[PDB]
Structure formats: C-alpha cells, structure tokens
Design a protein around this ligand. Structure first.
Ligand SMILES: [Mg+2]
Ligand SMILES: [Mg+2]
Ligand SMILES: [Mg+2]
Ligand SMILES: [Mg+2]
Ligand SMILES: [Mg+2]
Ligand SMILES: [Mg+2]
Ligand SMILES: [Mg+2]
Ligand SMILES: [Mg+2]
Ligand SMILES: [Mg+2]
Ligand SMILES: [Mg+2]
Ligand SMILES: [Mg+2]
Ligand SMILES: [Mg+2]
Ligand SMILES: [Mg+2]
Ligand SMILES: [Mg+2]
Ligand SMILES: [Mg+2]
Ligand SMILES: [Mg+2]
Ligand SMILES: [Mg+2]
Ligand SMILES: [Mg+2]
Ligand SMILES: [Mg+2]
Ligand SMILES: [Mg+2]
Ligand SMILES: [Mg+2]
Ligand SMILES: [Mg+2]
Ligand SMILES: [Mg+2]
Ligand SMILES: [Mg+2]
Ligand SMILES: [Mg+2]
Ligand SMILES: [Mg+2]
Ligand SMILES: [Mg+2]
Ligand SMILES: [Mg+2]
Ligand SMILES: [Mg+2]
Ligand SMILES: [Mg+2]
Ligand SMILES: [Mg+2]
Ligand SMILES: [Mg+2]
Ligand SMILES: [Mg+2]
Ligand SMILES: [Mg+2]
Ligand SMILES: [Zn+2]
Lengths: 58, 37, 175, 138, 204
RNA sequence: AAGGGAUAACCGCUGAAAGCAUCUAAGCGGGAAGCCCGCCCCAAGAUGAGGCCUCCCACGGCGUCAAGCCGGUAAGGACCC
RNA sequence: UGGCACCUCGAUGUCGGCUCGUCGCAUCCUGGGGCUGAAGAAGGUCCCAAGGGUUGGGCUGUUCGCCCAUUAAAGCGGCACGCGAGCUGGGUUCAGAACGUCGUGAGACAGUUCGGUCUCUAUCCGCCACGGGCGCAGGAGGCUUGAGGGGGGCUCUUCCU
C-alpha cells in the first residue's frame, strides 16, 4: 500500500512523506493506507485529496 | 637512502615533495633521497 | 607575493590570440600552438595584453591562475623562435652527423643511433661536439631533448654524457 | 478478498538519454522504470516495468578517481581465472556491459528481475531498431 | 594471407645439396571457390573453397544449386580461408612459393577414450614395490575439506585427439605443377586422407 | 614470439600553489618474462540462442482458425546393411 | 613449539615417500630501476614484478639436515604439518622375542633391534569426454563471426661489435 500511494501521489509534485504530513496535521485522516483504490480506480477525487494535502504544509 | 617508514631531513638542503600520493625527499646527492613506504 | 598573472603580457610583433571558448589558439609568424584552459577560469583577449581572471580562492583557482597564464607566456615567445636549447655532447670520439632530419649519432654503441624526430622539430647541428634542438613549442623541444637524454646517461664517473647546459657535478673518482 | 486487481495492459516504450548524466544516478531511475514505480497500478509479482531503451551508452560521466581504478570482476571456474578488468578498459571497448551490470546489480535476482533484464536494451548510437514511436522522458 | 585446401597423401625424404629433408607430399590440387564474403554483408570477409569432385547424384540440393562459379559441387567441407582473395576461378599451388613458411591446420588422430598416462604424459605408480592397482592410474585428484571440489580441467582421461590441430612455421620445399602438389617439411596433422588448410605463417 | 596500447618501481618535459624550485595539483611521455591485445583450438543451451547462401511452402478439413482440431506429402531427416 | 578445551569417543586414519597439482610473495634465478665504501666484470642492499622454472645422486624410516657433480636457481610457506573410498607400511600407536636401566616380582621405559591382515562394484555434488529430448516463433543442408574460457606464457652457451 505504501508503494501504491507513493507511486500515485508522486507525479502531482509531492512524495509520501510530504503527503502524510498534511493528513496527520490537517485532521483529514481518511485515506489511512487502505484507500489506495481511489488512487488506483478513480483518481479524480484522490487528486482532490492531493489538493487538500498540499495546502496543509503550513 | 631508500624506502623507509619515517622520513627526516638529513643535511638540511632537502626538498620534500609529495608526488603521486606518497612522499619523496630529494637533494643534489642522490644517496640521501627517500621514499616513504 | 606576486601571483603569476598579476603582471601583464605585452608582446611586440603582436601575434593573434582568439577566443576558442574552452581553449586558446595562438597564431604567430612561424607557427600556431594550443593551450587548454579550465572553463571556469576566464582569460580575456583585450588589446595588446591577454588578461587572466579567477573566481575565488581554493586549491584550483589559486594554481590554475598561473598555470593558465604561464602556459600562454610560453606561447608568446614560442611562436617567434625564442628557443635555442643546445645539447652539447662530450666524448673522446663522439659526434653527431645529420642526414636530413633523422639524426644518427655515435654514442659508443655497436650501431649509430637513428633519432627519428617528430613534426615541427629542427635538429640544428653547427658542430660535431654540440647540437641544438629548435622548434616552436617549449614542450615539443624539451620532450625530444629528454628523448636525447634517454640514450646516454651522464655523470658515470667520467665524461661522455649530456647536461643541457654543461654541468659536471658528477661524483668522486673510483681509481 | 477486496478488488485490488492490477489489470495489466500495454507495456510501453521509454528511451533514456545518457549524454552527460552519470551512471548509478542514471541507473536508479532506470531501476525504478524497469521495476515499475512510476505506475499506480502496482502489484509486485507481475512484470509491469516497461520497455526501456537507453541511448548514448558511450561517454557516461564517472566522478572522482574511479576510471582506471574501479576494477570489475568476471570469474571463471578454472583455477587462477580471476580476470580483473578496469573501468577505462570497460569504456574503451564494450560500453554496454557497464550499464547492463549497473542495472543487473539493482534489479531483483529471481526469475522476475531476470525477465526484467530482457526488458532493458542498451545502444551506443544514437540509433536503435525499435521504430514504432519513441517518446523521450528525463 | 595465402591458403589452400589440401589432403595428406604420405611423407618421405627429399635430398638437397647436403642434407635430407623429411618432406610431406600433400595434394593441394585445383580448388574451386563458391562464395565470397563482403564487409557490407558479413564483415569478416573470408572466401569459401571446396575441394574434391562429386558426381551429381549423392547431393540433396540445398547444396546443389549454387550459382555460376563451381557448378560442379565438391565433396568436402567448404572452408573459408580468412581474408584470402583469389581472382575468381580457382586457387592453384603457384600462389605459394618455395622458401615460404606455411601453416597447416588439419584434424589429428583420435586415440579413442585415451588414457591419462598416454594422454597427459604422467608417470603413475611403479610396477614393483607392493603397488596394488596404481600402474596406470593418475593418482591424487584434489585436497581434503578446503577447497573440497575438484578444479576444472584436472587433466584426466577422455577423448584425446580428433580435434582441429594447427602445426605452424612449415617451410615449402618443392612444388609439383603438373598434378598440383605441395611438399611441406614434415609433421602435418591428420592421417593419410585427412583434409587440411594451408595458410601463410605469421611470424612476421 | 616479432610487433601495439595502458602500466607498477624508476627516469622525465612544462608549470603554479610557494615571483625560486618541483614527475603533478591540469597535461604529455619513456618505462618489465607483469596486464590486455595478437597465435591455436572449445564455443550462439552467448535462451542475449547471432549472420550469409541455397531447396520447399496457402486448404488437402475446420475448433477455443492459418494447426494451437488432423491424414498423407515437397526439400530433408530417421530405421536397416 | 605453546596456552585454551569450542564441533569430532555410535572413531574426523597418524609420520614419511611416489603420482597429481593449485595458490600467496615476505623473489632463488630470469625482467626493469635507485643507492653504494658501484673504475669494468662479479658484488651488497632496497622498490616493482608469481609469467615460467626450482636437477641427478649417497647417508638415515625420515620432514629437516650433511657431502659429490652441475646449473642462472636447486626459494619459503598454505591447501586436515595437501593428497591411504589413489598407492606404499620404512618409523610410530597391537599381540612374539631380545638388549641396557628401574622394579623383590608381575611388568614398564617420549631408549635400541628383527618380524607383524592397509577393506573388488560410486547414490548425489565436482571433474574429464560423449550422447538422447526439447528450444532457437515456417521447416532443412551447409558455411561462419565471436560474448566468453583454457593452453603456451621458458632459458643458457659461442662469435662479431
Ligand atoms: Mg597457469
Ligand atoms: Mg581413431
Ligand atoms: Mg611408469
Ligand atoms: Mg599388480
Ligand atoms: Mg598389498
Ligand atoms: Mg568451498
Ligand atoms: Mg626545472
Ligand atoms: Mg608518473
Ligand atoms: Mg604515465
Ligand atoms: Mg609505452
Ligand atoms: Mg595451535
Ligand atoms: Mg569451560
Ligand atoms: Mg556416524
Ligand atoms: Mg584420528
Ligand atoms: Mg589414530
Ligand atoms: Mg615485493
Ligand atoms: Mg627480502
Ligand atoms: Mg635483476
Ligand atoms: Mg657493475
Ligand atoms: Mg602463478
Ligand atoms: Mg611459480
Ligand atoms: Mg599419506
Ligand atoms: Mg580408506
Ligand atoms: Mg581420503
Ligand atoms: Mg612398518
Ligand atoms: Mg610388510
Ligand atoms: Mg611383548
Ligand atoms: Mg574384481
Ligand atoms: Mg556418474
Ligand atoms: Mg546435444
Ligand atoms: Mg568454429
Ligand atoms: Mg574470445
Ligand atoms: Mg557461460
Ligand atoms: Mg586469455
Ligand atoms: Zn638535504
């Protein structure tokens, strides 16, 4: 699951360690590494999760 | 002399040259030149 | 303290120095030469003199400043025939006669040594007791003169060697 | 059983330029491209690491005193047969074995990565017989 | 690099002005060429000869059917003679000259499953002095626990001979033009009837 | 072996750091029965299974279709002496 | 040579020799070079270099060691002090017997001598050679390049200069 999430998030401009830091701090712990099937199946909402995670760096 | 572990400057006109990694010491008279090895 | 390159070039019979964006080509009245330059250090090609400029102070900018200037300074007097570079020979019956350019010479062997010169090296032989190696570049003359040294090794208890100027500091006799 | 099916389709073609890019640092993105890290549909048993051709296998830059000193090793089972070959000899002739050994040292060692070594072509050209359409990525 | 197809027919002595020479008479007759290689086609650029005549009914025609040069197909192995270049019809013996050094590459005699003492010239155990069964055995073949396994090429019994063997630096004594024969200086590899190729020796 | 290249010890050329000097920090050389070339055979089971010449080839029936459902047969191969 | 006693007492055969090798260099020679109290030759020492060689004998069971004739040299070591599912049994580590010594004696001695059973069939790995099946994306007859691997990688004497 770490390879699928890190594989899917990388082309958006952020890796796994940048991605989880928005989820643990922003109170958006939703993914929880079992939800890789939106990073695989339907990425138009996982990209919005990237949009919610990239603004939570500070 | 020749290859030694310690290198000292007998007959003070020695020149100490570090070439190709290791240390040589040379003079005019070639019986006092030294290689550290 | 004076780093070589803090004093200028200027050269009468003002040979041409061009850009050549990684190197230096020098064309003179006799020949052209070649000096490789490190690309980080900037030598400039202004009027009369050839300036040299280094960025900073470490173990490469402080030595390549002076390497880069001085290898040009050899090529300044190099292309105007500023090198004589004699090789005087000793010996009881040694001589060096020239046929064309391949300088054969008797150095005590069982056959006269045929010296094959490279391109651009002139073996001027005015005397049987002394020759001289001329050319354009200082490396091309000193290397071939070292090849002339490679036949006979001097200072072996007596004469019959070469010294590049004449310098017997040979050693004590053995009786 | 949850639906985590990889649904393997269409192995693609990527050529990598090696003009001044160093080995090792080049061979890690060749390693991840030969493995399949760029694809989100990942499953580690099926080989989805795409077809990668590398161009300009000559003049690969190496750093420091490693040319003439980094000596490879090719063993024969005969006694005394330890043929030591330097890196400047490996770059004088046969430039492809440097990159093939660099990718071979980074791929997995089983029958999967052994199959992945087939999916990596090396050419010192620039020319290659793979002529359908070749998009270049860096 | 001159070369020819040949076949051993026997050996004898010839007499020079003072010394006898142990010559081998060898039948390197008229050799038809069938195919030339090309740097733009195969690169190594050799030339394919074949030498001894075949009646056209034992052939099977992937072999019968080569073009204009040498329509009568030969018998033996169509050997390529490694950058040699004739004019196009055949290669006679007069390419070679007496006084030149020529290589002979043939096929030596297989001794069968030859022994280790006859093969690798060992010594073995003595006949007397209590020797149980060591009279032709090789003996020890390794060491105990380290290294363990026997090294590759321990020079034991097997198929000695019947391989392609090159004997070098042979000087040409005489040339027979009417039957197209060569007279090398002895020690040709191969039996009476073994085909060889005879190149130029280097030895520059 | 004769010959070629890169070399160890060693001998150098030019040259700053260190206005001098220096085989070295940039480079260019010479330099061994040592290393790789070169000689000979093994060798495409080098699945990375190479390359060239020549001979033959659509149905003669039908699927999960050009045999990956089958019977003879072209080039050839095999059995027997 | 030792110290330890960690696998081995339902046992891993011990010294030496013959055959067969392989590896390290801290090189005995051959190949280069520096110094020398190196006039030349012959030398001494040190640095690189293991590619190839390192004899035929007498003595003792000997490794070692001492002598004869040579060579340029008769190198030091490891591989269970290499090698007994290869061999030898001369010594030691069996029963017989004797000598010197100790012990009242039976016997003993890392003191000496003679003699004394050395175990036909290769299952797997390895190795030397030769094969069958299949593959080499149509089927065969040939020719052949070489990714790679081993062999050989010696050396002395005489003469001209
Ligand atoms: Mg060997
Ligand atoms: Mg036979
Ligand atoms: Mg015998
Ligand atoms: Mg018997
Ligand atoms: Mg017996
Ligand atoms: Mg082992
Ligand atoms: Mg100087
Ligand atoms: Mg040097
Ligand atoms: Mg050099
Ligand atoms: Mg050289
Ligand atoms: Mg011990
Ligand atoms: Mg204890
Ligand atoms: Mg047991
Ligand atoms: Mg025991
Ligand atoms: Mg025992
Ligand atoms: Mg040494
Ligand atoms: Mg010593
Ligand atoms: Mg010597
Ligand atoms: Mg002397
Ligand atoms: Mg060796
Ligand atoms: Mg040896
Ligand atoms: Mg034994
Ligand atoms: Mg036994
Ligand atoms: Mg045993
Ligand atoms: Mg005994
Ligand atoms: Mg007995
Ligand atoms: Mg008794
Ligand atoms: Mg029996
Ligand atoms: Mg067997
Ligand atoms: Mg087979
Ligand atoms: Mg072949
Ligand atoms: Mg090869
Ligand atoms: Mg192999
Ligand atoms: Mg080889
Ligand atoms: Zn001094």
């Amino acid at each position: 699951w770490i390879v699928r999430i890190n594989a899917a998030c990388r082309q958006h401009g952020l890796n796994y360690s940048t991605f989880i830091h928005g989820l643990k701090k922003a109170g958006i712990e939703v993914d929880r590494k079992n939800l890789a099937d939106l990073a695989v199946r339907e990425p138009q909402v996982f990209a919005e999760l990237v949009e919610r995670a990239k603004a939570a760096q500070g | 002399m020749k290859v030694r572990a310690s290198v000292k400057r007998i007959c003070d006109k020695c020149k100490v040259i570090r070439r190709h990694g290791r240390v040589y010491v040379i003079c005019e008279n070639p019986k006092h030149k030294q290689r550290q090895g | 303290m004076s780093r070589i390159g803090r004093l200028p070039i200027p050269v009468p019979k003002g040979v041409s120095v061009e850009v050549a964006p990684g190197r230096v080509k020098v064309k003179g009245p006799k020949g052209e030469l070649e000096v490789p330059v490190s690309p980080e250090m900037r030598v400039v090609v202004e009027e009369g003199v050839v300036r040299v400029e280094r960025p900073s102070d470490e173990r490469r900018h402080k030595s390549l400043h002076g390497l880069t200037r001085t290898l040009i300074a050899n090529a300044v007097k190099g292309v105007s025939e500023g090198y004589s570079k004699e090789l005087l020979i000793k010996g009881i019956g040694y001589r060096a006669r020239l046929v064309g350019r391949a300088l054969e010479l008797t150095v005590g062997f069982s056959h006269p040594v045929v010296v094959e010169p490279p391109e651009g090296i002139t073996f001027e032989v005015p005397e049987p007791t002394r020759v001289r190696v001329s050319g354009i570049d200082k490396q091309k003359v000193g290397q071939v003169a070292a090849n002339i040294r490679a036949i006979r090794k001097p200072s072996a208890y007596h004469e019959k060697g070469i010294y590049y100027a004449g310098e017997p500091v040979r050693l004590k006799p053995g009786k | 059983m949850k639906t985590y099916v990889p649904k393997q389709v269409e192995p693609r073609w990527v050529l990598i330029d090696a003009e001044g890019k160093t080995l090792g640092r080049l061979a890690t993105k060749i390693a991840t491209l030969l493995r399949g890290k760029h694809r989100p549909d990942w499953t580690p048993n099926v080989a989805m690491g795409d077809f990668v051709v590398v161009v300009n296998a000559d003049k690969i830059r190496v750093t420091g005193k490693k040319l003439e000193q980094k000596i490879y090793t090719r063993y024969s089972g005969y006694p005394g047969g330890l043929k030591k070959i330097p890196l400047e000899k490996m770059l004088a002739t046969h430039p492809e074995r440097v990159l093939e050994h660099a990718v071979k040292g980074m791929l997995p060692k089983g029958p999967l990565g052994r199959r992945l070594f087939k999916r990596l072509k090396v050419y010192a050209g620039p020319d290659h017989p793979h002529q359908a359409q070749r998009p270049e990525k860096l | 690099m001159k070369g020819i197809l040949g076949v051993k027919v026997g050996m004898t002595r010839i007499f020079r002005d003072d010394r006898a020479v142990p010559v081998t008479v060898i039948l390197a007759g008229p050799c038809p060429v069938v195919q030339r290689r090309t740097p733009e086609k195969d690169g190594y650029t050799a030339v394919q000869l074949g030498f001894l005549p075949q009646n056209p009914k034992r052939v099977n025609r992937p072999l019968k059917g080569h073009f204009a040069k040498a329509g009568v197909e030969p018998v033996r192995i169509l050997r390529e003679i490694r950058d040699f270049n004739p004019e196009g019809d055949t290669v006679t013996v007069e390419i070679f000259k007496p006084g030149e050094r020529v290589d002979v590459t043939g096929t030596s005699k297989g001794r069968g499953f030859a022994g280790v003492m006859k093969r690798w010239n060992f010594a073995g155990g003595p006949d007397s002095h209590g020797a149980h069964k060591i009279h032709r055995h090789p003996g020890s073949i390794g060491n105990r626990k380290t290294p363990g396994r026997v090294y590759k090429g321990k020079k034991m019994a097997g198929h000695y001979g019947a391989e392609r063997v090159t004997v070098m630096n042979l000087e040409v004594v005489d040339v027979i033009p009417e039957e197209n024969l060569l007279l090398v200086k002895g020690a040709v590899p191969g039996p009476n009837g073994g085909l060889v190729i005879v190149r130029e020796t280097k030895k520059a």
